[PDB]
Amino acid sequence: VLYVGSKTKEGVVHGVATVAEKTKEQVTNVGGAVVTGVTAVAQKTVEGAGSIAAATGFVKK
Amino acid sequence: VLYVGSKTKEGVVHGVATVAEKTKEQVTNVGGAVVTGVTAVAQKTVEGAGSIAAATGFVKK
Amino acid sequence: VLYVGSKTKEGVVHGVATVAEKTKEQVTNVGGAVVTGVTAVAQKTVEGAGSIAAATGFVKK
Amino acid sequence: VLYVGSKTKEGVVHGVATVAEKTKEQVTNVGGAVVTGVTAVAQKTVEGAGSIAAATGFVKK
Amino acid sequence: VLYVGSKTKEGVVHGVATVAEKTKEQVTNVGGAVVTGVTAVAQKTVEGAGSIAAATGFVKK
Amino acid sequence: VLYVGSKTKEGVVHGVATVAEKTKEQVTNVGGAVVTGVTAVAQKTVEGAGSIAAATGFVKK
């Protein structure tokens, strides 16, 4: 068996330029979940769940 | 067996330019889930679930 | 067996330019799920579910 | 005399997003003038000449 | 005489995002003038000449 | 005479984000003038000439 991994790329982010001009930014949360403003995020998972911008209100039993 | 992985790309983001000009940005949440503003996100999952901008209100039993 | 993977691309995003000029942006959520504003997102999943901008109100039993 | 200058805008540039993906860029010049790649330039002149991307080969007498 | 200058803007640049991905960039010049790559430049001139990306090969007499 | 200068802006640059990914950048010059790579430059001139990215090969008499 011969695996040759040359310059491979998995879960990669490069060359990102952003500008944000906001006068007012407000977030109100009451017993939930809120995710805002996620930029230039990379990951790699092996034998597991991969979530990036995940939000769940609640879990009950 | 001979696997030759040359310059392959999987789950890759590059060359992104964004500008956002907002006067007011408001988020109100009551017992739910809210995801906003996700930019330039890359990932790779093996033997698992891959979610990026996932929102779920709630889970009950 | 000989697999030769040359410069292949799977789940790739490049060369994206966006401008957003908004005066007011409002999100109200009561016990649901809301996903807004997803830009330049790439992923690759193997043996799993791949969701990007997924929203589910709630799950009950 | 009453001049009221409220939020006026003269020679203004805002909200610009550009991406350039070039493999090779070459410029050869022999005794001339070359102007390339001008982005997001603003100016205001009073009692004078306003040139932005101006090129002149040569002047002789 | 009453001049009221409120929030006026003259020769202004804001909110600029750029990405440049080049493998090779070459400039050869022999006895001339070359201007390249000018981004987000603002100016204001009063009683004079305003040039931004100006190139002139030569002047002789 | 009453001049009221409130929050005026003249020759202003703000909110600039740039990324440059180059493998090779070369400039060769023989008896000329070369200007490259000018970013986020602001100025104001009163009773004079305003040049930003100006190049002149030569002047003779």
Brief descriptors of the model:
mainly beta; 61 residues; homohexamer
Can you put this structure into words, describing what you see?
- The structure is a homohexamer of 61-residue chains.
- The first copy, chain A, starts with a strand and ends in a 5-residue tail after the last strand.
- The first copy, chain A, has no helices and 5 strands.
- Chain A has strands at residues 2-5, 9-30, 33-46, 50-51, 55-56.
- With 61 residues, chain A is an all-beta fold.
- Chain A binds chain E through residues 15-19, 21, and chain E through 14-19, 21.
- β4 of chain D pairs parallel with β4 of chain E.
Helix-strand layout with pairing:
Six copies of one chain form a homohexamer.
Chain A: E1 2-5, E2 9-30, E3 33-46, E4 50-51, E5 55-56
Number of strands of chain A: 5
* Sheet with the most strands, sense and barrel status of chain A: none
Instruction: Kindly state the percentage of residues in helix of chain A.
Output: under 10%
Oligomer: homohexamer
Q: Can you write the helix and strand succession of chain A as a string?
A: EEEEE
CA gyration radius of chain A, whole angstroms: 18 Å
Contiguous helical run count of chain A: 0
Report the β-strand fraction of chain A as a percent range.
over 45%
Chain pair forming the biggest interface: A-B, 61 and 61 residues
Shape estimate of chain A: flat
Structural class of chain A: mainly beta
Distance between the termini of chain A: 49 Å
Keywords (chains A, B, C, D, E, F): Acetylation, Alzheimer disease, Amyloid, Cell projection, Copper, Cytoplasm, Disease variant, Membrane, Metal-binding, Neurodegeneration, Nucleus, Parkinson disease, Parkinsonism, Phosphoprotein, Repeat, Secreted, Synapse, Ubl conjugation
Family (chains A, B, C, D, E, F): Belongs to the synuclein family.
Sequence repeats (chains A, B, C, D, E, F): 6-20, 21-31
GO biological process, one term (chains A, B, C, D, E, F): regulation of norepinephrine uptake
